Amino acid sequence: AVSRSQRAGLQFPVGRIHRHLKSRTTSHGRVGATAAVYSAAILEYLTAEVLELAGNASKDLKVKRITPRHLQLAIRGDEELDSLIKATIAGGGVI
Amino acid sequence: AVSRSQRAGLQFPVGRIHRHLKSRTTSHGRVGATAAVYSAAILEYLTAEVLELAGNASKDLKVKRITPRHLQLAIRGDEELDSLIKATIAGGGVIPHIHKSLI
Amino acid sequence: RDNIQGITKPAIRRLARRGGVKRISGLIYEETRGVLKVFLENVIRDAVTYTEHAKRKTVTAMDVVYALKRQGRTLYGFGG
Amino acid sequence: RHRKVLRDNIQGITKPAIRRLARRGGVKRISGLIYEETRGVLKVFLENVIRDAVTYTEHAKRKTVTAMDVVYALKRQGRTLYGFGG
Amino acid sequence: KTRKESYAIYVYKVLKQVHPDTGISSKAMSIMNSFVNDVFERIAGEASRLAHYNKRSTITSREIQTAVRLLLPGELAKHAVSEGTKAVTKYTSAK
Amino acid sequence: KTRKESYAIYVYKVLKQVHPDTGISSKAMSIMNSFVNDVFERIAGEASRLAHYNKRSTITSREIQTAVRLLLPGELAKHAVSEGTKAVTKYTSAK
Amino acid sequence: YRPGTVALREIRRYQKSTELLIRKLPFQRLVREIAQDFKTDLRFQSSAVMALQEASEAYLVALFEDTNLCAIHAKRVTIMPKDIQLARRIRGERA
Amino acid sequence: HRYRPGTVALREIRRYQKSTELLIRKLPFQRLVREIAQDFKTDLRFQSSAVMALQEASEAYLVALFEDTNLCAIHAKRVTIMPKDIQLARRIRGERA
DNA sequence: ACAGGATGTATATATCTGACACGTGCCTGGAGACTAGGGAGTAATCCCCTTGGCGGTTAAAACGCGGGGGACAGCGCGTACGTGCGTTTAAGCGGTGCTAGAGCTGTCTACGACCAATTGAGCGGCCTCGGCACCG
DNA sequence: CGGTGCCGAGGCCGCTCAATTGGTCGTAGACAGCTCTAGCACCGCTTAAACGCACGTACGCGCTGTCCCCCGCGTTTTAACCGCCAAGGGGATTACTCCCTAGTCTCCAGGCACGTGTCAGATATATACATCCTGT
């Protein structure tokens, strides 16, 4: 009952990520338990980066809630995430 | 005593295509029997179109042997095949294309 | 007024205003009518094929997201 | 036992070479300031492709870069190339 | 040394079917082999994605047919699905 | 009716970790959920492709690490691989 | 008054907000008319046509921004149909 | 006797368009590829086929870029290309710097 | 406005050699025969979300008029790239040799798949309250 | 800068099904060893191509009328928007059952390296013709 996510000191549900990675593989694909914590850490770092940029933009606009406009601003603002995320934010807007 | 390709009257290996599709199918997934036949037919028709275009292109240059230049000319000649093959042909070169204000 | 003509002049004008266009000519209206028609056609073909595969008769949002995801113009905010 | 720390090879793509490329490209006449900027874009393109290929061949634990890995790197950049490996 | 899988013989056979006299260089044969592998990879990936979308696990002829109606543009896709249905009917209506 | 899998709770947790006071709208939460699913899908697909390239069948931490060094651009990838190694070391150096 | 000021006012106003510009009902009628060809007597979730509207609006905005770059390249300040066709040729949609 | 200025250019257009063979000197390009490969990781070796394929993809991308810039410039009511045309074409396509 | 007239191009032949189509010996992956189980096809049932319609209501479209502005032929000039010439270098070829890492092959072991008994966290409801969306 | 209202979002239960730890195995990869194909480094020779430069001539850039035409306002007019009500098609479940495909055993034949003997196409060369460049 040690809750492996906390054993990695992470927030993401490493068991759920494990059974997710379990399916999207080749014919007899196996995943390693060491890989699930790695993907979980990757997702946690990326979400933390995007959300802290959005929160900085929100405190710029002085709003407690983060709106999709804040997400658009934070993503297109810093060049790195924009270069990663080529997507189109729903209801986001432009610069 | 017969092979599945001749059983369906095709020319692509149904067993090999079936093994590949079994080898790329979301580990707990399965592959239907007829699906390999369908995929083989699809690939056969695509190769038929490209090779016929290459032959018609080469026949206008009086060469019995098809070369990558003929592949690139046949692919970029047609529109929809050009929409399919978005890649680059090794050594294929470009099509002879001259614009308006170049004189 | 054909069904395409719902995309009228002030709509396309405000659209160009969002992009930062300072001044628009006359034929741009017909041009963008044709262009948007092409784009919606390209998306809706894929959406209808997905839905017809799923044995349904309702183009749900999930299939629109899938069709935009395949065409290199992915869109968040609707799940999938 | 590696030697020859390379330098100045960006001038390897010489001016008649880029001239010949644009002649194939369908360009009639060329202003003289092109050569530096096309050297730059060639540099950055080769940087990205070689970076991806090196990451591939380092993942396979190899001290050399095979052709198949370069083809894979070009595939992952939307500029896939036939003829060599797939 | 271990043999490598290819497609060259089948390309030669279908070429001789459509054009009885002409030939094909080895480099062009490798090009066609890579092109076949690319198209088949795209079709397999799209069919797997579609099967994962519709919560099914058995890629039958239906998802493959939808994949060729997806990837290839209009009349090419029409000829393709026609030949596919013809081939699968010839297969099923046999011994 | 059957519940649907999401990521919203973990996004909320990591948000409260990085920003203790701010909030996030439900629509922005759905946006972040879709973005997490997209990034994880890209990483899983790339890792599967890499494992199929190198003729192996067990996606360990190595192929995942190569996937994040592939997809994400430079310094973001550097921070990501650093956090990944840190998390996997914290996991391994435990009970 | 003078021409050249209300334009910039529109620039500022329509980039500050993020709400939908194309009015919903004629767009939905257009979508139904276009779907009338590829199948008969469809039905549409309102969320689906909302998503189509969002994506099409984002696409048209991107195209206008790019063709504005194209127009300002030729020292003009008014766009023209050849500019839009040039932008779509350079992106490569060739449609 | 002398040609009109530009006729030789169109002759070379026809020549280098109907040809197929490679267009950059092999050894300098290979040296440049190794030089760029240095800083990413040291002590790297290269298959000759790999450098050949890099040359193919390189010339393909540069030919596409040059053709597109020629389209841009011929739209711009000029005949000579210019570096801002290249920057414009790359900015349209999606690349940047 | 065709008349010379170098300057490049069809064209037919000759050669020539490396490429390739075809014939081999060999050999694992395709086929056929059977069985097991489980994924989905169909059948039925519920309910909800979609379409249809009505009626006000009112902001947005939409002609239309007018007035300034900018797109654009048209000159005109003043840098600069093409078209040569002679001159130098390093690309390429061909060898020649050196060595090291790619690629197999055989053991060994370790870690992840599988199965199960357990239990707690993640989600559906659900309440509730205060962050924000407007309004002097 | 306060007031009022709004319900969106955040915190709190019930519950149920997915993590999770314990025990087994077996197969996939780690790894040591051994080969040898192929990549790297000179060396010399040739020479085609890069390179410097001297003119000059097409043309990029700029300036100037100038007339089409596009933006701004003003009025009407029109069709979207909100709200609400009604019917029901189809989406979303559950429940059987059986069709179909994953396996295993046996077998052999289509397919794959390997050689080779013929020849198709590259290359060169010598004719028979387009084709630009002044020009009476």
Automatic annotation (TrEMBL), chain G:
Subcellular locations according to the entry: Chromosome; Nucleus
Residues in Core Histone H2A/H2B/H3 domain copies: 3-90
Superkingdom per UniProt: Eukaryota
Transmembrane segments: none
UniProt GO MF annotations: DNA binding; protein heterodimerization activity; structural constituent of chromatin
Keywords associated with the record: Acetylation, ADP-ribosylation, Chromosome, DNA-binding, Hydroxylation, Methylation, Nucleosome core, Nucleus, Ubl conjugation
GO cellular component, one term: nucleosome
Subunit structure: The nucleosome is a histone octamer containing two molecules each of H2A, H2B, H3 and H4 assembled in one H3-H4 heterotetramer and two H2A-H2B heterodimers. The octamer wraps approximately 147 bp of DNA.
Family: Belongs to the histone H3 family.
Protein name as it appears in the record: Histone H3
Species assigned in the record: Xenopus laevis
